[PDB]
Amino acid sequence: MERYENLFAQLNDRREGAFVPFVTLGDPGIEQSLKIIDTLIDAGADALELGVPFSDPLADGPTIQNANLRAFAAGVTPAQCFEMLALIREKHPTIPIGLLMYANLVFNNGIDAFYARCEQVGVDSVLVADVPVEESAPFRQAALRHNIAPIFICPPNADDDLLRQVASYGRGYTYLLSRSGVTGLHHLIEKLKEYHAAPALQGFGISSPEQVSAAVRAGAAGAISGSAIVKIIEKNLPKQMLAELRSFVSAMKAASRA
Amino acid sequence: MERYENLFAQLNDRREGAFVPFVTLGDPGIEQSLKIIDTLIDAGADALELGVPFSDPLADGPTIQNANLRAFAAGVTPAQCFEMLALIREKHPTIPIGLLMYANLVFNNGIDAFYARCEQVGVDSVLVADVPVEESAPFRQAALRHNIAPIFICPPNADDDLLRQVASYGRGYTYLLSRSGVTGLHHLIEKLKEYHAAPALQGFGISSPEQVSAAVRAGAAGAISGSAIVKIIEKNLPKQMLAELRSFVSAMKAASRA
Amino acid sequence: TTLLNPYFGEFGGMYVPQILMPALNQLEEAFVSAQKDPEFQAQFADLLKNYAGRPTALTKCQNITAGTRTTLYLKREDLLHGGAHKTNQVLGQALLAKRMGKSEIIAETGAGQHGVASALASALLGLKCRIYMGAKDVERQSPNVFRMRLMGAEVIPVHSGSATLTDACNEALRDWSGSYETAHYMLGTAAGPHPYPTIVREFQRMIGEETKAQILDKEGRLPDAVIACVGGGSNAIGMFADFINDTSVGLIGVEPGGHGIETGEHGAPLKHGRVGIYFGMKAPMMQTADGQIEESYSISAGLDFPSVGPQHAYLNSIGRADYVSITDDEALEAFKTLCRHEGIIPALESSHALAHALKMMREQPEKEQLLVVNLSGRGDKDIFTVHDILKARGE
């Protein structure tokens, strides 16, 4: 989790915001995915959010459902995702790496064993999309024991109890949910700081450079963008692919200076 | 009905039995049917039993159902049947003519009007297949008022009440039913004579010269044969037709001498 | 002679070949004895309750009468085991057969609800069952066909005549003419020769008896009118029987108008035919000028019959019951209306009765009236029929 804390220090020291893209690991293939991920970091991504293919991606809309399907068509398994994670970390020592998991993949072989593998490969955080704070105790405990930041969702209309629990339970960054529904509001940022929460990133629907500067100005530490990157992978399903995502990322990160 | 009484007098005077065939009027056509009927009488038929085509011939099996269908295919209507009856009677002054009717054709335009037409054309008797003795009062009354013999069925297992009612209510001849079911037992003959019933003819299944002599020997006044004639019409559906029925009738009537 | 009156005024009787009169007399004697036998009545009540599911619900329709002064209840014979009121009286007749020591059952069916009812009663009570059905009917409710033979019944398609319900009826009497000695003929409506109109009424009268108890419990009074479709007459007389002596209760039977009475493609002999003799009874028939029985027509196979039971002809003649007709299009609208606003899919037969109740409400929406529709069966068997019609239109 200490990579996130060094990144955020070196962004407001820069008076800058974070831009964090999401891709599904192994989409559209293993070797290809590693090239997209390298292009994302070179194009200026501050951190990564990486999805492990799951049979039933319940919080994901059609854009990322098909990302999972494409990865499954390539034979991508969780074990091979952790081999990819090891290679990504070995090339990029400082880039924070967050995983987007579903509960059954974390619980399958033992919760502690899962987080132990995350630590061994150099993962910095884990968001489990279908574990609310109410159910999170064994997951966040195993995460902290293995130096993994557990990431929690802060929904738009969130009560004060939820803001306090997210602030106390989370590490690395606070996921600011921007709407309801599935993949495809400034009043909470100050209260999160009041309770010493991990820095907030807004996500879940961001697709153009407009939203980033808006979030940085709202005092949010940065933004996350999911389907927009996958759609760009989607639009150009190989050489013209990589140039398409490189162009997108720089516009996003330019907007985080102000 | 007086034709029947003259025929039976002139058969036991001959020490002979009656052979009465059945055909459906207008099967397979109007003009053709008149030729079959003429051949039946020339071949030696003592009397006739003639069916008027009905939409729902409930007491008739497939042989005579199809006879009705063939007559309907020719456009044969009850009115045209009564024109045929007039022509048959005008050629054959002494041959008793019985009609096989279903109740709705008799009731349709008025029961009395129906029997009045029977008398006008020279019909001698009417059997209404779906009117039991229990329901027969207006039919037999209208029949007797128009000098038409009402014919009644005597079933094989018939109680003494039924034997008495049939004996008292019937005229012309008593129809000795030979089995159950639809178109396709000596103990009762003496009791019918004991109650002064009209002379008995056995029918409803007769198809070869064996049964006739058996009935005459049982003291029955003769026999009726339905499907066997229609099947012969059926087998040869025109010239070879007529020779087929001529051959059949003479064998039947030869058997009535003894 | 007979134990019971075979006529309703001028209608009814026993117009069968002499060979069948002992069978009818035997059945009449067994029925009279059973009706006096508390053990028979106990067995019949047990099957009705514990096997068929009686009493059936009386459902108040809120949505479809909104904005009017009509209160509409539906007597839910669609909830009876088998999906229609046919099941009530086959259970009684099957017991009658066993009372007579008979081991085989003959039945006729057009829609198939009665054949399915015959087969299920025979499966339960150990009777060997065979069913005559116009071959044109076997093609369009193959679902109901396969239901009967799943239940061990022999299904015999009919090629004689028009190859439809009336032809199926004649095959049954033809067969029963063969040997009534071992088989009982399980006639499926309140028509045919005596004693069937009487027996079927008495074995269906729980429809009306329950309706009366239930309306009195829920409304504290008798209904203004009870409305039922009329194919041969069983569900209607079953609804009507217990109200006949409550002279303030209107009794409304609904014949199929088919494409329209003026087209002649209809099944409404009671109001638009004339008296004749067929199927063992004297009753209104659709017939040609010279007395041939006509073919009838209805969108609903179970109403498609060119005659009607004699007690309805009689109730009409003295003014006790009133009879109307509902066309195919009107029945289809009431079917859709019930699906969409009450979540009940009714038989197209019952939809004629529903259609007429909706007409009484809509024509006079401020008339205060408490109505019961005999909902004689469910319309799962009709969804294919309704779909093909809806597809030939737009929608």
Added chain:
Amino acid sequence: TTLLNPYFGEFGGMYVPQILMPALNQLEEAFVSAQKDPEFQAQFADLLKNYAGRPTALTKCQNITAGTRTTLYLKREDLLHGGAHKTNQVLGQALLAKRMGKSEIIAETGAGQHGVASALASALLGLKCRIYMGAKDVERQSPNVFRMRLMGAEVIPVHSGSATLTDACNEALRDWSGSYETAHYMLGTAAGPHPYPTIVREFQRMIGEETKAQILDKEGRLPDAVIACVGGGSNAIGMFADFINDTSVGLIGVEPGGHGIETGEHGAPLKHGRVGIYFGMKAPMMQTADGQIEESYSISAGLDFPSVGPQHAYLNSIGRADYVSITDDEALEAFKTLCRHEGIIPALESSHALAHALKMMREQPEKEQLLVVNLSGRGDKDIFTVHDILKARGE
């Protein structure tokens, strides 16, 4: 925090995205309030009786147990309006939705009995209903599809994933993730996140309550065992709930064995899967070695689900209830047996429960035992399935 315990031992919970927790908490609060509200209970009882037809019959099977010491009764949820037990709890949940001021309904369905139940409840109570169903399911019970849209429901085929029931389940949560603010998600079984396993049990427990009253009336004692099929768990827990504290009453749930457990083409996660987290609950799942959810298989669409409700996993764990499996061929034999010897056409789902009761009788025919099968629905919807199977064989 929650008002009620969300777990049954280690099984259950609320494993949903944070965005949905207020909706679950709202539903839990409404349910607790309704359960204490006599006016809600009166309205629910009225719909169950007067609209759905409760109480359902308890039918004693004479023929199929002949020659053995087994007495077998069938709790006739096949006679409920709609043709299955699904109807009971949709009426309660639809009232809950109205209690919350919600006007739209979301439902998932595979066999279609629950979607039809959802549509009919929504038609009756004025709710706008939309139904997710795996597109592979829309092809094979087009009958049930057309029933829902006749009733004004929007039917939404599912192309994501395997295009079957589990995929239909994820679409519903996906949509409800959109706006729970106006829509209520009408989950169709005793599974999913808390409070659904608790709510569905309580809204189905009249199955067992009536069974207990009726067996005591007819036999003067409790049954030796109650047997029910288990797709997600609602009819079984509905049968079981009122007997759980009668410790002498065996509780037997029957999972589909499909082609045979050893083939892996089955739907029996409780005895042959292992614990996982999916569909908002921790419960037995069929899953790959690395935690992907497997596809299940059953001849009967309504059992074809790779998980099971958490209360069954818990009742199994402590030994209170026992779970077995019945293969396709065994379920098909019990289907035929019931048609032919009792004249009842059962759902293939319920035929698994029947098949296991017949096995308990046949394996030990001199063992004295009083058994109840939850007959959860009728098999009209399956006669096409059964016909095609019978045709591929001889017969």
